[PDB]
Each structure stands twice: as structure tokens, then as C-alpha cells.
Design an enzyme around this catalytic site. Sequence first.
Site: not given
Lengths: 403, 404
Positions: A107, A110, A279, A284
Site C-alpha cells: 500500500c 499508508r 480513495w 489504478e
Amino acid sequence: KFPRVKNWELGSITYDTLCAQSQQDGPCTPRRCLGSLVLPRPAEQLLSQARDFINQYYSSIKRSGSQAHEERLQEVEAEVASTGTYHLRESELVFGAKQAWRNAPRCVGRIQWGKLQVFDARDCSSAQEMFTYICNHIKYATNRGNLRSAITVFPQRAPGRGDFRIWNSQLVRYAGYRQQDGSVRGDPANVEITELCIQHGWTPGNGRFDVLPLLLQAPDEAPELFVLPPELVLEVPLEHPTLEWFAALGLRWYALPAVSNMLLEIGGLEFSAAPFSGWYMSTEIGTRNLCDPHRYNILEDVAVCMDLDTRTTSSLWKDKAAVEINLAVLHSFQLAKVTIVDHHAATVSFMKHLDNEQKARGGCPADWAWIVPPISGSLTPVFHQEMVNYILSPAFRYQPDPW
Amino acid sequence: GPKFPRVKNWELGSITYDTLCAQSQQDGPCTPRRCLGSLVLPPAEQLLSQARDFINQYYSSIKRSGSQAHEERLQEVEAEVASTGTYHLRESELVFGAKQAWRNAPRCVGRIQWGKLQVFDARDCSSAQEMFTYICNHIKYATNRGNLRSAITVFPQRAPGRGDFRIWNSQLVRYAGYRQQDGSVRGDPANVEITELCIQHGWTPGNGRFDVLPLLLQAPDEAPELFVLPPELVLEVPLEHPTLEWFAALGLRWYALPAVSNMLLEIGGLEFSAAPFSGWYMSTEIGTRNLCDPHRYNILEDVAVCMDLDTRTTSSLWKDKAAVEINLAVLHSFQLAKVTIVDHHAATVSFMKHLDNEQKARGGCPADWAWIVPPISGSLTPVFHQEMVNYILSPAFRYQPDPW
Ligand code: HEM
Ligand code: HEM
Ligand SMILES: Nc1ccc2ccc(CNCCCc3cccnc3)cc2n1
Ligand SMILES: Nc1ccc2ccc(CNCCCc3cccnc3)cc2n1
Ligand SMILES: C[C@H](O)[C@H](O)[C@H]1CNc2nc(N)[nH]c(=O)c2N1
Ligand SMILES: C[C@H](O)[C@H](O)[C@H]1CNc2nc(N)[nH]c(=O)c2N1
Ligand SMILES: [Zn+2]
């Protein structure tokens, strides 16, 4: 022993010592590195994992060794001794969800880890009740486009009893309808789930962006089908800042990335249904979801609209189209006032995260191949940063499909 | 099922298993506790076993494994090591080893070409002056007026109690990096130290952004000697853009031949400390890394300003837009100049073909994902979606400490 970690743009060196706290094996051995594989190939076990988590929790609140700590350790010890399992207090659960996010090597978002709204849904007994919870999560997280990170936690797994599961991989997903002529209308990543929904009684649409129903499963029951109220599902139509023809493509994406198929593990307890959302990072949607060959695969269409040369790779037509698509996504979300972050801002905030974590814990588990964005890799600071990868608990894990 | 790594391609859904990794004799930096796969630089008994291994590899490749000549070669190597402490490779063994080292190189995306490598034996070289002659021949042959040809030149091996043959420069062609009084750098910041090392050894420096460096060459147990390359030997390409007419006015350029020269070539436990090799460029090496890295030429902002982009905000994707055009200029100019180059798409597509060849031929292919995926447009290329297994096979190219 302790990894030497170097940044090649700046010449700085850190030393990861947090990895020493890892208790779970990853896929690599000295003989061969398997770090690019997407997926993985008694009562004392539980009790040690529990003790360690409780120890983490009381340390976090700066109360290690205290009377409440010692007492909480015994409650846990007595409950496992008698029943083979135990239960978390809500505050502990809140700490655990936050740490699992923090510990997630893949991720990039973070920096935000301490800001997580945690819903306790452990008092859930039916698929119907799971739906009400899921509906409230969506309303909270969406917040009219001012997105807020959130997780809802359904009952933990229990010895010899089926799991609570959300069958869909995300709370919002577009149907993918297999045409008999080989092709696929919609999102090809979602063919199988679309077919399961249909088989379980869903009447299917035939657009490219049909929001799917949720299949929810309470233990040892057939899954049930629930259509999300369309007003709960905020979507953003895509238009481009200077290419007026772009909006004619009819492309759109949903605001909320809410992942529902991962298992949350805390203190040896496993939560098989624990959807979370934050979000999107623009790539992506812009790069992976729309331009991946096994997804919406719109690279060629956009390229022709832009009137580039498709006949050859060296005109970099693919790179050109991809950039405009990503630009369309950022412009559109900002227009529709929905939270989104571009890959430059995200990766820059991740470096600051690495720095906060280096001082806080002596390191930070990170999977380089996932942290580096899918376009413009070396144009971001993370490309040039060495990273160490390992499994800390609490953690989000993958788990088998319930079907 | 099988007890070897399972390897998936996520675009195509296809699965393979890597059995080749079972041949690996050297440990990488990873352990079950932590993956370190993203770090850039992580006795006659020992020799003989490596030598025996390579000879077995060699006779395997010529289909004479277990034969009389195989056993005699083994015995001959055992004996040579027994009397001298080292041994010597035959010419065809050298040719096979050099090619196998390239084939085994996990970070190289150009390995489809591996069987086509001109091997120059230079194990007769006895001086720095002669190394120069050898190097110039290599450059001329490899450059071939722009129709580039892969080659490696092999100088004598490491000898017990004798100094190494070393080429000090990291490449045969490198631009000077001039540390400025104002703290900044003129030319290539990557080359600051080799530049200073050259001057300290009597080179008179220029003051351009693109001054070709002299070579610092070292024969055993002698101080390095300085050799200037004759300019006609060093093919360069001035950079222009196919439609942005102003790009040519930036005066940017790059050289045709990537010829790496600081790597150690290891074969059967023998170490060739000086063995420069060269192929041709993938365009992203120049367009993205060399020209756009913060710590290199750092021209992203210049080009973006010229393209009239909003560089005040990340969300305008101005870095991405400029990067693409720079890369496009590299490709266009190299083609126009008729100098061999491959774009990052064609390169990655050809590497997928290589993985399929090597799956059949060897049961796998060691590959470093972070290096194989290009630095722009990653998921736009097919290798991004391909799982890879990384491990050290021998013969190999290795990093080695700098001679000073
Ligand atoms: C709030 C802003 C956030 C941003 C910008 C962000 C960004 C990202 C991105 C780009 C990925 C790569 C995903 C992919 O390529 O499929 C990822 C992965 C991941 N994120 Fe975050 N994320 C955010 C919030 C969260 C939250 C709230 C959680 C959990 C509480 C979380 C947990 C994870 C996990 C476990 C992964 C790995 C997923 C996997 O391995 O499949 N993230 N994130
Ligand atoms: C024929 C055309 C070739 C192409 C297009 C090509 C492409 C590349 C690229 C793009 C890299 C990444 C280097 C970086 O980013 O710094 C690389 C690495 C490498 N190549 Fe190739 N290459 C070619 C030929 C060769 C040859 C002829 C050899 C040796 C005989 C070779 C051996 C290596 C090695 C050892 C690396 C890893 C270098 C390192 O780790 O520093 N390559 N190649
Ligand atoms: N913006 C965000 C935030 C968090 C996210 C968490 C997860 C995901 C998608 N996970 C990867 C799915 C790919 C996959 C396929 C098959 C098996 N495992 C994983 C996106 C997020 N986005
Ligand atoms: N086109 C090619 C072909 C072969 C190549 C071989 C090597 C290189 C550059 N090697 C990496 C240099 C960067 C570096 C710096 C410090 C420590 N390790 C590596 C390019 C090639 N290009
Ligand atoms: C094979 C490779 O590991 C796989 O395609 C990974 C690479 N890096 C990724 N990075 C992100 N963020 N998301 C992904 O799905 C992937 N896929
Ligand atoms: C830290 C990271 O490993 C480093 O920046 C690597 C990443 N991948 C790379 N890939 C290639 N081809 N060349 C490189 O120099 C690098 N650098
Ligand atoms: Zn590894």
C-alpha cells in the site's frame, strides 16, 4: 542480520531493524527470490500471537506492564484455555485494523494509516444485517465525494463453522458479460462474479458499467443477493481538459475503492469479512483498469481518437494515449470534487511515510514492485528507493474464494 | 503439483514452473524472513568444483556429456589446477562461457539475442597500450557505422599473486562530469569521480555537457595509463524531435554504443576482471534514466517549460508528458541517424519470446522484475504482468569493487 537500505537519488542510507519483528515466512529463500509472485503458493500458537498483540496494544497506549495490561493478558489466557479461542475488545480491534493497514507492504497510501474509521459489525447474524452495515459504510466513506478511510469488521472465523464472507472482490464492481463471440462486454476481471450473481437470481444489464449486486454469505448459508441503492454509489464521468471528444467515449468510474475479499488477522483471530476503503490513486483507474489488455483495454481507441500512428511501437502511441487517459481521470475527479491522488503526490507522501516509520519503528515493510506506479516509474522518488519486504502482524491477507 | 516455483502470467492466465533454479549454486540476498530483491548491490577445493561444473555445462551444450573427451578434459583441468593452482580455458570454452554469462544475466532484457555475441579473445594482451588497441578494435567492430553488433573482448584472467587487468571507466563511452564552484555539475553527475580521476592522471578537461572521457587503462601491477579515443571512433546521435522543432535547439545528444567495462566475467571459477561488452540501447535508458533522472542530466523541467506545461502542480502530469516526448526524440533521432535502437515495447515483447524459448530449452529463466520492467509505461509492456524467478546462475557477470 540488518538490511542496509539505500536511496540512489539522494545517496542516503537507513538500516531496517523492524524486520527482526517478523514472525511469518515470505516466499523467498537464499536460493531464489520469488518477490514478484502476486499470491502465496495449537492453542499455544493462538496464545502466543494473542500475547504479542496485547503487548503491542498496551505499548501503543503507553501502558505496558500496568495493572490493566497484566489483567487483559490473563483474560485472554483464561478464555483460550477454556474455549480454544478469545475475543477482542473494540478499542483493541480499532488498534488492530489500523496496524494491519500500516503493515501492508503493497500500500502506497499508508501516510494516512492513523486516520481510519472503524465499524464494529461483530454483532451481525445474517446476510441482511451485513447489507445494512455495508450500506452505512459506503455512505460514511463516500461523504459526498469527500472520501474518508473506513473499515467494517464482521464476526471472526470460528472452529467448525462456515465463514462470514462478501463474495465480491470490491463493494463496487462493473459487470462483465461474456458474449458468445469470444469478446466481453464490461469489465473482464469480473466475468466470474457476474455469472455467480446471475446464477443466484440477478437479472443482468448489458452496458459497459453496470454496477453489480453484492452476494453476501452468513455462515453455512447459501449467499444472498442485494442490489445497492444507486444513490449510494457515487460515479465520476470522464472528460478531458482539452480533448472535447473524450467525453463522447462514455467512460466513467466509481469513486469508492472498497475491497471486500481480504482477510484481516489480528492477534491470531481471523476476520474473513472486513471490507475496507480509502480513495483511488489515479493510475489504478487511468492505467490499470482502463488500459490493461485484460481489462477495458481502451489504449487503441483513444490512440485513434488522438490520430496517432498505431502501425508501429516506436511512435510511442501507447505512452501518449495512456498519459491523456490518466489526465482525464485526474481532471474529472477534481471537477466532480471527489478525493483522488496522482501518482506523483502519492509516491512523495510515501517517502515521507518511510521517513516517519524509520524513526517510529526502525523501518517499514514495502513491496517495491507494488509501490512503484505502473506509468512513469523512475519519474517518481520511490523508484530510486531500496525497500525491504516482510510480514508483520496484524495483517491483511488473501484467502480462497468461498465458491 | 511440482516442487518448483510456480510462475504465472496475469495477462494471459498461463502457468509455468521453474526447474532451472535447481541448478543455482550461489545464494542471493533473500531469506524466508525478508525479501531484499529490490536492492541494487546486496582454495583449490572451491575452484575445482566450479571448474568441474562449468566443464560439465560445456560438454552438455555440445552433446558429449559422459564421453571420453569429457572425462579427459576434466582430468586435464584437475591436473592443471593441481600444479599451478589455476587452469586455462580453451577458446570454444571461452566462447560458450561468455554467451552463457549473458544468457544467465537476470537484469538484462535484451537476452533474446544471447546466442549472437562476437567473442574477442584478448587473453594474449600484455600491456595497457595493447588493451587500448583491443578496445578500439572492439568499438569499430561493434559500432559498425551504426548497424550495431554485440561483442565482448576478454583480457587475461585474475592470476594468483599478480595484479588485475582493469578498465577503470564504467563504460568505454562516458560524458565528463564537471563539479562546479557553485556546487552544481556540468555534464553527467554520474561521472564526477571518474572525471576527477582522469584529471588527477593528467587529462586536460573540457567544459562541455558532453565531453567524451578518456580511458583509464590498467595492466597488472602498473599505474593506469590515459588514452584518448579518436573522435571518429565514437559515433554520436544529436537529439531532435519529429514535430517539436525547438527540441533540436536544446543541443542534447547521446552516443550510439553502450559498452560496459567495469563488470567481472566469472567462468568455472576463473575471473576475468577486464572484459568489456556492448550491445545496443533500449531507448528508455537514454530518454528516461540518463536524461530525466534527478541525479543525472535532469532535463524534465527544461523540456516541460518548453512544452509550455504547468510545472507548478503534480496533477498536470507534466513530468509524464515531457518524459514521453524526450523518449520519442531518442527513438526518432536514432532511427533517422540509422543507428540501432529498440523501444521499450519491442524490447519487452522480444523478452517474453525469450522466456518462452528458455522455458523449453532450460526449464526457466532467471529474471529480475524490477530491472526488466521499463522505467516509463511499465504496465503498458507485457513483462509487467509476468511473474519472474530470480537466482544466480554461473557463468556470470558480477559487480566488482572499483580499482582505486
Ligand atoms: C486512503 C488512501 C489510500 C490510497 C491512496 C491507497 C493506495 C493503494 C494502491 C495504489 C494500492 C495498490 C493496489 C492495486 O494495485 O491493486 C494499495 C494496496 C493496498 N492497500 Fe491501500 N490505499 C489507501 C487506503 C487504504 C486503506 C484504508 C487500507 C486498509 C485499512 C489499505 C490497505 C491496502 C492493502 C492491504 C493493499 C494491498 C492489496 C493487495 O495486496 O491486493 N489501503 N493501496
Ligand atoms: C543486444 C542488445 C541489448 C539490449 C537492448 C540490452 C538491454 C539491457 C538493459 C536496458 C539493461 C538495463 C541496464 C540499466 O538500466 O542500467 C541491461 C542490463 C544488462 N545487460 Fe543487456 N542488453 C543488450 C545486450 C547485452 C550484452 C551483449 C551483454 C553481455 C554480453 C549484456 C549483459 C547485461 C548485463 C550483465 C546487465 C545487468 C547490468 C547491471 O546489473 O549493472 N547485455 N541490458
Ligand atoms: N485505492 C486503493 C486502496 C486500497 C486498495 C486495496 C486493494 C486493491 C486491489 N487489490 C489488488 C487486486 C489484484 C489481485 C488479483 C488477484 C488476487 N489478488 C489480488 C486496490 C486498492 N486501491
Ligand atoms: N543496452 C545495455 C546493454 C547492457 C548493459 C549493461 C549494463 C548497463 C548499466 N549497468 C547499470 C549501471 C548503473 C549502476 C550504478 C551503480 C551500481 N550498479 C549499477 C547498461 C546496459 N545497457
Ligand atoms: C507479476 C507482477 O508482480 C504483478 O503483475 C504486479 C506488479 N506490480 C503491481 N503493482 C500494483 N500496484 N498492482 C498490481 O496489480 C501489480 N501487479
Ligand atoms: C532501488 C531500485 O532497485 C533501483 O532504483 C533500480 C530499480 N530498477 C532498475 N532497473 C534498471 N533497468 N536499471 C536500474 O538502474 C534500476 N534501478
Ligand atoms: Zn526476494
